[PDB]
């Protein structure tokens, strides 16, 4: 619905050139200069390009903008992992008498073109705290990090039997090092935690499983 139209997603491998289109009308891009904003995950937008093709100080030359008729384009050469972000075009609109934005493009940076090596997840599993148990609650916390590609499945076991009830697992998210993380939580009653020899969090990644196990009376 946004006034300027951008692709929802663009992807490339490190080192390549990618482009992001921005289509408008004679009342905005056709008449007025285009700006671009870059929004890194979890941060505010920053001005990336102004006046079609001008860079603020600090923005590298591998970012370049252009305009042609009622459309504009952002080109990024030498694509780097840190370029993964949402990009927005913008221009003044004479008909609406105000600034308008494109809908945003999520730029993802893939693994190396020649093949990014698989990385198995690191798994840390915490048992319920004494504090939580005293409140008559219990949560097992399974933290999963450093995996690539960014997809895992998580299964929980009470002793050796599957448990599905009480399991909540996040989507994978990108880490600063370009690998991925996720977490999974198992909610139990303190009585259930007492009623088994152990519980386990089993993380499967690219067909291999990494398991961690905790028990109510051990001192790991």
């Amino acid at each position: 619905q946004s006034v300027l139209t951008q692709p929802s997603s663009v992807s490339g491998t490190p080192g390549q050139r990618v482009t992001i289109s921005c289509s408008g009308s004679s009342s905005n891009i056709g008449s007025n200069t285009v700006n671009w904003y870059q929004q890194l995950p979890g941060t505010a937008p920053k001005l990336l390009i102004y006046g079609n093709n001008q860079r603020p100080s600090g923005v590298p030359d591998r970012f370049s903008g252009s305009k042609s008729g009622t459309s504009a384009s952002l080109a990024i050469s030498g694509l780097q992992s840190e370029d993964e972000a949402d990009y927005y075009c913008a221009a003044w609109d004479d008909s609406l008498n105000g600034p308008v934005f494109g809908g945003g493009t999520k730029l993802t940076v893939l693994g190396a073109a020649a093949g990014q090596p698989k990385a198995a997840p690191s798994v840390t599993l915490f048992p319920p705290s004494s504090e939580e148990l005293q409140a008559n609650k219990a949560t097992l916390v399974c933290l999963i990090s450093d995996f690539y590609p960014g997809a895992v499945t998580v299964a929980w076991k009470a002793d050796s039997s599957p448990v599905k009830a009480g399991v909540e697992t996040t989507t994978p998210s990108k880490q600063s090092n370009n690998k991925y993380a996720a977490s999974s939580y198992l909610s139990l009653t303190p009585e259930q935690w007492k009623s088994h020899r152990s519980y386990s969090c089993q993380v499967t990644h690219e067909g291999s499983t990494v398991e961690k196990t905790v028990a109510p009376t051990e001192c790991s």
């Binding site: 946004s2 007025n32 700006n35 904003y37 505010a44 937008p45 920053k46 001005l47 102004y50 927005y88 913008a90 003044w92 609406l96 008498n97 105000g98 600034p99 308008v100 934005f101 494109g102 809908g103 945003g104 840390t124 915490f126 705290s129 004494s130 504090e131 939580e132 409140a135 949560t139 916390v141 933290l143 990090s145 909540e168 697992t169 996040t170 998210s173 880490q175 993380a181 996720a182 977490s183 999974s184 939580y185 001192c219 790991s220």
Partner: protein, 230 residues
């Protein structure tokens, strides 16, 4: 340098109003327009309007005309945005942004952005988190490390921040994105990897803030009671 500091996260019921502030510094306050721009979760940027701190004139986005009000206080270099008759669709991060420097409203655009203020509009009940320590392993080996952390359990709405030792401890910290449980409540964990040899000699405190509920907790994370080494 230009700095824009916004007020903290808020939660509101449908029908209520919210007033967000933006404190400016590092430039001559009355010489630059201030824009407001919002972003619904996972969605795009939407311009809300602009105010001239010299004189206080405003122009608002047509779609918000009639329930947005922008104002400023030139003595405190603060700009305010008030949005009334809130609905769920107004859930967004609200940004103030200083204009590039136009001498006219026409051709203005936001250049220097504040950190944003998350405003959640929901009929669900606000809940502050419980915070539990995640105690480190009792293992002791030369050059060994241990993971310790805090579990921030059952809060609504977002967001929550976690720091360690007032932000003095940053190496080896990994704060995980929250899970949204079927209960409608969030939980997250923050973990720090530290040397095992020094557990019990070092103090580790997680500072948790849930601004929508005005909850602030500082939880000490200590070696297990069963740990005979640390």
């Amino acid at each position: 340098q230009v700095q824009l500091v916004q007020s903290g996260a808020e939660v509101r019921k449908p029908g209520a109003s919210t007033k967000v502030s933006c404190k400016a510094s590092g430039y001559t306050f009355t010489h630059y327009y201030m824009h407001w721009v919002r972003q619904a979760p996972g969605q795009g940027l939407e311009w809300m309007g602009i105010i001239n701190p010299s004189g206080g004139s405003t122009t608002y986005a047509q779609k918000l005309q009639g329930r947005v009000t922008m104002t400023r206080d030139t003595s405190t270099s603060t700009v305010y945005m008030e949005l009334s008759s809130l609905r769920s669709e107004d859930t967004a991060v609200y940004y103030c942004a200083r204009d590039w420097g136009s001498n006219y409203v026409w051709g203005s655009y936001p250049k220097y952005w504040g950190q944003g203020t998350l405003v959640t509009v929901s009929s669900a009940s606000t809940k502050g988190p419980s915070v539990f320590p995640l105690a480190p392993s009792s293992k002791s080996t030369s050059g060994g490390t241990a993971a310790l952390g805090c579990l921030v359990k059952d809060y609504f709405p977002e967001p929550v921040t976690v720091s360690w030792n007032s932000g003095a401890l940053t190496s080896g910290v990994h704060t995980f994105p929250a899970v949204l449980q079927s209960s409608g409540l969030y939980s997250l964990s923050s973990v720090v990897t530290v040397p095992s040899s020094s557990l019990g000699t070092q103090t580790y405190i997680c500072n948790v803030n849930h601004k929508p509920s005005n909850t602030k907790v500082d939880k000490r994370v200590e070696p297990k009671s069963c740990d005979k080494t640390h």
